[PDB]
Amino acid sequence: LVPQLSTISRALTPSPVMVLENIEPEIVYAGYDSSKPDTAENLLSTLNRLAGKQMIQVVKWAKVLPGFKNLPLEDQITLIQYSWMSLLSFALSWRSYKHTNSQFLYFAPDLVFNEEKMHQSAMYELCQGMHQISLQFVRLQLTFEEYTIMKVLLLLSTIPKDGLKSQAAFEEMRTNYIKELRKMVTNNSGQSWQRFYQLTKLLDSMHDLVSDLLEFCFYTFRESHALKVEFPAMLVEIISDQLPKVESGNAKPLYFH
């Protein structure tokens, strides 16, 4: 009989962390035009357009994300829709850390926010909250490997209150990625667990931040006409789905602590 196990294949297959490096999207440009006045209506509309371009890259990433194809298609779609703001805000803090040593908010290479832009955006305190995560990355000296695993954990951090089509398949993927993070921080058990706790505390802290970001997002979406804030098709699709679900209490956050 032909062995159906392949030692060679299992040995040669890149680790999940190596695959995450391989599939990480290239940096996206905002197409920022310096000729427009730096008023909230213009800055926020630019950010929303940048978000639409980023989400095109998130979907491409999710398609090749190990384990994600094992979930029901409806669940894959659901998880992308519930986690979008967590994914994009965490990646903003990563780019800010890597490209500016967390001195600025690096939304795109052509759109870097200093304090002045943060004021002009009319969401200063929200920018401060995102900046505080970037500052935590410096304090923790977060690694790229840790960051990529934590991004997947954020994709798996909010589920519908009723539940997914396959709760079991979801739990299996979530447990597998938590295991990957636990391996990354490993001998000194004391030090490994202390770091693991710092990373899961940070993950949990994204829920309160994202809640505040979505509150402002839904507000500007509802008042888009009055406020002259534009949204691209991709965000209209996502927010039209999410706004009623989140505001009705259907979004259940998953915490480590």
Ligand X SMILES: C[C@]12C=CC(=O)C=C1CC[C@@H]1[C@@H]2C(=O)C[C@@]2(C)[C@H]1CC[C@]2(O)/C(O)=C/O
Catalog residues that contact ligand X under the rule CB under 6 A. 44, 47-48, 50-51, 54, 88-89, 92, 107, 123, 126, 213, 216-217, 220, 229
Pairing of strands 111-113, 105-108: antiparallel
- In terms of CB distance, is 164 or 229 closer to ligand X? 229
In angstroms, give the least distance from the CB of 73 to ligand X: 24
CB 83 within 8 A of CB 164: no
In angstroms, give the least distance from the CB of 168 to a second copy: 7
φ/ψ of 127, rounded to 5, equals -55, -40
Binding part of the chain for a second copy, among 4-12, 39-47, 100-108, 171-179 by CB under 8 A, reads 171-179
Which of 23, 178, 227, 243 contacts a second copy by CB under 8 A? 178
CB 185 within 8 A of CB 192: yes
Both tokens assigned to 91: 């990646």
Helical (H) or strand (E) element with 251: strand 251-253
Site for a second copy in 188-207 (CB under 8 A): 188-190, 193-194, 197-198, 200
Pairing of strands 158-160, 105-108: unpaired
> Residue 95, annotated ligand binder?
yes
- In terms of CB distance, is 124 or 197 closer to a second copy? 197
Cα-Cα end-to-end distance for the chain: 50
In angstroms, give the least distance from the CB of 147 to a second copy: 20
Q: Which does 178 bind (CB under 5 to 8 A by kind): ligand X, a second copy, none?
A: a second copy
- In terms of CB distance, is 74 or 171 closer to a second copy? 171
> Residue 188, annotated ligand binder?
no
∠57-112-31 over CA atoms, to 5°? 55
Q: Which does 220 bind (CB under 5 to 8 A by kind): ligand X, a second copy, none?
A: ligand X
- Alpha carbon distance 196, 188 (integer Å): 12
DSSP 8-state secondary structure symbol assigned to residue 70? G
Pairing of strands 158-160, 111-113: unpaired
Q: Which does 107 bind (CB under 5 to 8 A by kind): a second copy, ligand X, none?
A: ligand X
DSSP codes, 92-146:
HHHHHHHHHTTSSEEEETTEEE-HHHHHHTT-HHHHHHHHHHHHHHHHHT--HHH
For position 34 contacting a second copy by CB under 8 A, the verdict is no
- In terms of CB distance, is 99 or 182 closer to a second copy? 182
Q: Which does 185 bind (CB under 5 to 8 A by kind): a second copy, ligand X, none?
A: none
Question: Under the rule (CB under 8 A), what is the footprint of a second copy?
Answer: 168, 171-172, 174-175, 178, 187-190, 193-194, 197-198, 200, 254-257
Binding-site residues for progesterone sit at: 48, 54, 95, 220
